[model samples]
Target chain A: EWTGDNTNAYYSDEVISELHVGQIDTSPYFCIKTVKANGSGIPVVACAVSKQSIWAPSFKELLDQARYFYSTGQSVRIHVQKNIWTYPLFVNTFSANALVGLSSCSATQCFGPK
Target chain B: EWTGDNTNAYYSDEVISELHVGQIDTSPYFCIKTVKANGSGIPVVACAVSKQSIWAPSFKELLDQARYFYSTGQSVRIHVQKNIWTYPLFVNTFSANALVGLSSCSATQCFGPK
Candidate 1:
């Protein structure tokens, strides 16, 4: 059970839909898009890496767990911050853009701070 | 007038078709895909930033110039290295990966290394 930024947003029962890796301002980064398990809500796109933003301290855990669940195709809870990406074009490309934590979940509940 | 790695690959007279910024393994990054000015060849996709790789030394120049040209929609020469990103799924998403440099170009020639 990982604790994420309570001030940030969280979406549970999400399955990783799309993923990408690259560099920005010379930092290695990855972003993922998650959709509701039952296909209910708009997709959530978030990013987490060792950059100087809010989620830097939790980058390792979030990424490792993200990969673990991404591999298993499991439903997990994801925490993200909105409006952190200020790059004009990039902000236009992805609106919801930050990853703070990832936690395991069950059919009815998730294990992370939500 | 900037010079790029001669050993890496380069494409002259290209327009940035798309650009994305994210993180991978705790580093910030950016990737861009360029199409030939005359639309003669396949699009070239490349990533760059302050990560540990052959292009780290040139990160600042490439990113700054990339933004400069990208802002103006100018045809520029782009330099990149191949096969740097190995994140299985990401690799499947982008084939040519690694940005080394960007330079000014004219009708018949570019100011950067070929």
Candidate 2:
């Protein structure tokens, strides 16, 4: 998966909205921003959230929840949750690539199920 | 070569200056900002200009030439130039790694220059 940040918030609203509306032709790119102490935040341009889905909540909501969990000292599970719609497709492609170029070997070299 | 843009201009003067003074440690990271039509431009965050030299001229100078060439529709060769000091060092490392994996081959298998 390719990972990078949108520092200007350029891709946050329009990009995610396009994904939800099925306007994204190829795979979706997910974005993440950094949360600052003053409650405002900048986009974390290098963090790759996930490749499966591009639909994320508003940056404020996401940051607030993260901050609340941090301040309360609560152990919160920030799941990089995957939608059921896309998971199987990813798995199938992964499996197909793995099975390509299967080979048999002699006494010196050996080949087994990948 | 690794490439990526610095949309924030955070790495422009400070980062490039550090490299010119040999302050860049093991590897230096380069940054590039985008030039818009209005003279002031946003950063182009995804374009990887180059990896060897991080030091670039001021954004204004670089963008002005690019704009002038575009407006006149003239063919401008914007050289992504490299420093002579670093070029030999990179070439040496590349040659060393290529030579390390040389191996003998049987009658059926042939080994040749990289």
Candidate 3:
């Protein structure tokens, strides 16, 4: 399950919008870690308000999101704690890598609204 | 041989003042890395005029310097690139640990006259 800040106004909708429900490719190199329903659809990836994701959100999730964006010829903002250099796909949007106070951040405490 | 800048007027003499020619005790924990004539005497320690000493000057050199200071019951400024915390014995003297640009500082280039 994903978490967010007071922006829950668009939390579920925003995530569901990007969480593409489709068949994930099991290609090598291009896709190392894969996720899905029952280990077949997507990762337990989280996006937050502070908004650091605790568990090292798998790169698969990034790929998944990117593939999804391409599949539907869609574009969206995927706020990530990592530099776009690791996932150039998000270079066009996810540019908040300079985030701090996220070393041991929890989903709620982090995505929680002020 | 120690190196310095235009401070040579005070460099060699100043270092010699701190580099007391004496016998160093070979103790365990109190003194781990030893220095002496032909491998016994003093560390290849340098006091710069940006005085970062390269060639990890043995801690024994620091010990020897400290011991000499105590033997003669004297105190001198040992401008070191290290923190006094490492040599609490010099907590009363050498306190120039916050220094920078000494990572690859050459004796002359570093301590040289501006």
The top-ranked prediction according to TM-score is 1
DockQ ranking of the models: 1, 2, 3
TM-score of 3: 0.17
Q: Write the per-residue lDDT of candidate 2 for residues A1-114, one digit (tens) a residue.
A: 111111111111100110111212353322222232233434222111222223221222233333332333322112122222334554342211110011112223211111
Give a tens-digit lDDT track for model 1, residues B1-114. Answer: 112334567888899878777777887878888899888999888877565575575565456556656766767777677777778876677654777656556576564444
- Every candidate's DockQ is 0.05, 0.01, 0.01
Report model 2's TM-score to 2 decimal places.
Answer: 0.18
Interface RMSD of 1: 11.5
For model 3, residues A66-103, the per-residue Cα lDDT tens digits are: 34333432212222234412334532333324211111
**lDDT value, residue B71 of candidate 2:** 29
At residue A97, give the lDDT of candidate 3.
43
Top DockQ prediction, candidate number = 1
lDDT of 3 by residue, B11-77 (tens): 1112222121110111111111112212324432332211123423443344344444423422233
Which candidate would rank higher by DockQ, 1 or 3?
1
Instruction: Name the candidate that leads on lDDT.
Output: 1
Give candidate 1 misplaced runs (Cα > 4 Å).
A1-6, B1-54, B57-114
- Supply fnat for every model shown: 0.00, 0.00, 0.00
Give the lDDT of residue B92 in candidate 3: 28
